[PDB]
Amino acid sequence: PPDLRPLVPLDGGRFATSDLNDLYRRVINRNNRLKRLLDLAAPDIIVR
Amino acid sequence: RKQDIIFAILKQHAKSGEDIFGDGVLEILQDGFGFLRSADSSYLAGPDDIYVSPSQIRRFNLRTGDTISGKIRPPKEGERYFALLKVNEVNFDKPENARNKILFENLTPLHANSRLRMERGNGSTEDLTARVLDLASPIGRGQRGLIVAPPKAGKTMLLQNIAQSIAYNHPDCVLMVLLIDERPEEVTEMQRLVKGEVVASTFDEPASRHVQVAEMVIEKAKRLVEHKKDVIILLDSITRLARAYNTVVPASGKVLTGGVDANALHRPKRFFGAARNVEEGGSLTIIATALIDTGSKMDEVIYEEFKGTGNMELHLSRKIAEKRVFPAIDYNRSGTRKEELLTTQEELQKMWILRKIIHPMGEIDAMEFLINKLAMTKTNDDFFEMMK
Amino acid sequence: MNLTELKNTPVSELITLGENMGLENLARMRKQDIIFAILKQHAKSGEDIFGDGVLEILQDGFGFLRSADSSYLAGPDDIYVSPSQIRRFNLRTGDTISGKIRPPKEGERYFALLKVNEVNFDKPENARNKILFENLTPLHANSRLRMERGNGSTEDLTARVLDLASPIGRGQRGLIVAPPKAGKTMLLQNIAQSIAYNHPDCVLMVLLIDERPEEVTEMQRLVKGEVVASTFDEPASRHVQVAEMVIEKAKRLVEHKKDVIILLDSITRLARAYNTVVPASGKVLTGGVDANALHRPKRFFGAARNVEEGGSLTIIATALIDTGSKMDEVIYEEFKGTGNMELHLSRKIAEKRVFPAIDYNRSGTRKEELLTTQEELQKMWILRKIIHPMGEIDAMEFLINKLAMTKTNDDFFEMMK
RNA sequence: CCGCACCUCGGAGAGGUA
DNA sequence: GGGTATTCGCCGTGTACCTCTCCTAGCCC
DNA sequence: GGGCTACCTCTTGACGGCGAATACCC
């Protein structure tokens, strides 16, 4: 849940994002990339 | 309720192994995929929309507006939309004919060449509006005009007469009356009166659905023009559409006089200028009705900006409308540019003589003269022969 | 292997060539993508690729080579120009560059420039040493640019009336003031045709900003020259960009002693675009005009000048009046005291279907003795003194009936005496 | 805010205290 | 089939408190 | 200077000792 992994509210536009949110973002990116690549029928090496 | 029943029936039918068929207009989202909206819901996002995979979009080069009809399947565990297995018909034609097509952005525009005569020919008293329209402002294929009129001038009756004359004289043309931000009862009345397709978006929903329906309609029109079709769109919402775009546009810090954003008139002006006559085949005519003297300076600014865009203005007089004289058309203010390309030499000379005779007379006097002269006969040919 | 050569080829031949090269199905592909794939496949074999275009230096420091067939619109086939080469050859916005190009590698999106072969249609050794346009000494119109056809055609009457009313020379900065629905389109077409027929050596450029696409494609297929236009479907930003590119190209051409002719038809629309793109300063003048909005159109208009060292720049803009908007009236009243030639057109004469509907009384040219001989100037003065008492419509009818009798104006002048 | 002008709220490191 | 040389790297860092510092700007466009 | 997005470089080292990978025979 987002309250258990919130963004630290600090002054300025930047944000020291939590490591868990960064990991979730990376996993979502790497999953969406494979989801959009599997429909294109890419070569087996790239899929692997 | 009917949608859930159809969903359950299609599931039970697919459990046996039979094929399921579907249809709808494609709406490609920004993420890459799209859905097949339904026509009976005025292109509204439904729970039973057909999902379109990006693979098929890349395979057939599908775009927003393409009518797609093919085999669908019910969703599996973890899905919420119908997956598209095989497309059978694309834009009421085979995909092999739609793959070798020219984009709408590459078509060469031209002026109105073919004459779209609005005169009925049955000698009815309702035909007087179409006769006056043909005498004042002849309309051709690909015309881009504006129906300028204050409120309570007779826009509804004039629009109904135009639609009926189009359905009577030109039944082959695809008539689409898109009404945005209007009353539901008027929409129902129009849909059960005109002979064509009626898509609407009442004020019960925000302007986002208005913009979406406008985009779907213009994309379908562009695709039909690409398929060599003559599309005619009677959008009596251009002012409402401009208000919607000005409401949904992000603030830029540059607001014009009357509360108009600097980049708000871009989308409606592009929608208006999309109408053009194609030399390779087909045309697109958009007849819009602008609102003036509505008490808001925003509408006045919108009208003044859109005046320099079209090539046809049909002004209506409030006094003649209050005197219950229909059609209450301001003959002096009306006109069409490059009218010699839609009328013959003798017809142009007769129209010039009629304008030179009508101009000195007043509005009410000219209208009474025209009505008394047209009531003597049924066709305008006898009027032309008697004027000489 | 040239970009413009592949752009001029039709779609069918390009599809056939791509299918022969053995690539993906090009039938369901854009022509630009087809050309891009063909260039990639041809460069994979080791051959060289060449391109050209007008340079548009960005604010960051890099730039692209726009194409003329797309009205200098941002395209995927633009050639990237590194700032290093710009700093090495002192390139500026408007310099025509033609050199070898290469397809973009992995991680790139535009063609790169390796070696420049020709600058401004000339050797780079002649372009490295040049005098800027801001340093050229201005002068009045010296050379006479006669607009009369001389073939005795019925359409030559407009050119004859224009020559009798306001002769045009090199470096002239005039204005065509006319209310709407007067005949500006036919007049501009006749002017462009007469310029292309009498003086084919001059570089003719027709700028049409915020106009209808039908008129654009009509002008493009009618005049014998370059047509750069921007329809109303585009924002004012593209209008400003096109105007800047056109004026920069004109300046770069004049710097090489070239005779540039710009037939502007949207000075009012250009001023409206500049007033729309300027940030609000909280101060609005009478009519809705910003205090700093007319400066850019003022400079664009004043760029026209005659150069003594060589070349000239002629700008003929058509201003709009009686349009119902006070902003256009203020713009016209401000630009009236700027130019040195006004060719007014009367709506009352246009309503009578008397073409051309030219207001001969208010027309004229300053320092007209520098473009006409003594006897010609005396005959024009006598004709003006005879025409002045008569009314506008009567004078126009008299002039038409007297010019229809003969083919040349010299015979009319000789018969007047 | 549209136009001047009178005739019948966090993670790492360093130092210290008990 | 099993009893045991080396060893690849498997998880405890006393408790409490205080002060201070460090916290991304990259590419062809 | 910048948009959603991708390139920086390395097979904290001791241990305190506990369970256990492939190995050498009995």
Side-chain angles (χ1 to χ4, degrees), chain B residues 104-146:
Chain B
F104 185 81
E105 300 82 6
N106 301 331
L107 302 177
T108 63
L110 277 184
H111 297 266
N113 301 331
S114 181
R115 179 66 172 93
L116 296 180
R117 194 166 307 274
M118 302 291 297
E119 173 178 332
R120 293 287 208 86
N122 49 16
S124 179
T125 171
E126 290 80 52
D127 197 15
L128 296 180
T129 300
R131 291 168 67 178
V132 173
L133 193 148
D134 292 327
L135 294 186
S137 61
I139 302 182
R141 300 189 185 272
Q143 189 69 199
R144 179 176 60 259
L146 282 175

Side-chain angles (χ1 to χ4, degrees), chain B residues 256-326:
Chain B
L256 276 67
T257 304
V260 183
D261 200 333
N263 301 331
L265 300 180
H266 180 246
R267 300 284 296 274
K269 185 163 54 179
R270 289 196 59 179
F271 177 87
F272 196 23
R276 62 187 63 178
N277 183 22
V278 182
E279 183 181 1
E280 291 77 10
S283 60
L284 176 58
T285 301
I286 296 180
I287 304 301
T289 75
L291 285 312
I292 65 174
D293 303 330
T294 61
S296 180
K297 197 175 184 180
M298 175 178 59
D299 304 331
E300 176 67 286
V301 175
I302 292 173
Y303 156 73
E304 192 69 22
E305 178 68 286
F306 285 156
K307 181 179 180 180
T309 296
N311 50 21
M312 167 179 295
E313 295 77 10
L314 188 64
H315 302 258
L316 304 190
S317 180
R318 177 176 292 184
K319 181 183 302 178
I320 311 178
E322 291 178 358
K323 208 179 180 179
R324 298 304 178 182
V325 179
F326 295 91

Side-chain angles (χ1 to χ4, degrees), chain B residues 58-59 61 99 103 108-111 144 254 266 269-270 273 276 279 304 308-311 337 352 356, chain C residues 24 27-30 212-215 217-218 221 232-233 235 276-279 323-325 351 353:
Chain B
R58 176 58 183 177
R59 190 189 314 270
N61 290 35
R99 60 176 183 177
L103 304 183
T108 63
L110 277 184
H111 297 266
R144 179 176 60 259
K254 305 176 183 180
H266 180 246
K269 185 163 54 179
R270 289 196 59 179
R276 62 187 63 178
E279 183 181 1
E304 192 69 22
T309 296
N311 50 21
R337 306 183 183 185
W352 178 87
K356 288 299 180 180
Chain C
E24 196 179 354
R28 299 178 299 270
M29 289 185 60
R30 296 170 59 257
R212 301 175 178 88
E214 42 265 89
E215 302 177 2
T217 185
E218 174 179 27
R221 298 182 177 181
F232 53 87
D233 297 325
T276 306
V277 300
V278 57
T323 60
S325 180
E351 291 180 358
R353 301 303 178 181

Side-chain angles (χ1 to χ4, degrees), chain C residues 98 104 120 196 210 226 336 373 375:
Chain C
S98 303
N120 295 299
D210 194 72
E226 194 184 277
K336 181 179 181 180
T373 61
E375 57 279 356

Side-chain angles (χ1 to χ4, degrees), chain C residues 140-158:
Chain C
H140 297 272
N142 301 331
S143 180
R144 171 63 183 273
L145 295 181
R146 190 170 305 275
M147 301 289 297
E148 174 177 327
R149 289 294 197 88
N151 50 16
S153 180
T154 175
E155 299 294 336
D156 200 12
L157 299 180
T158 301

Side-chain angles (χ1 to χ4, degrees), chain C residues 133 136-137 139 170-171 253-260 305-314:
Chain C
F133 181 79
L136 304 177
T137 62
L139 275 186
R170 301 189 186 273
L253 289 181
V254 171
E255 284 176 340
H256 288 268
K257 301 180 180 60
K258 296 297 182 178
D259 300 330
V260 185
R305 62 183 61 178
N306 183 21
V307 183
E308 184 179 2
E309 291 77 9
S312 59
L313 180 59
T314 302

Side-chain angles (χ1 to χ4, degrees), chain C residues 3 92 136 151 203 226-227 321:
Chain C
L3 221 175
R92 297 191 303 179
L136 304 177
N151 50 16
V203 181
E226 194 184 277
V227 179
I321 64 172

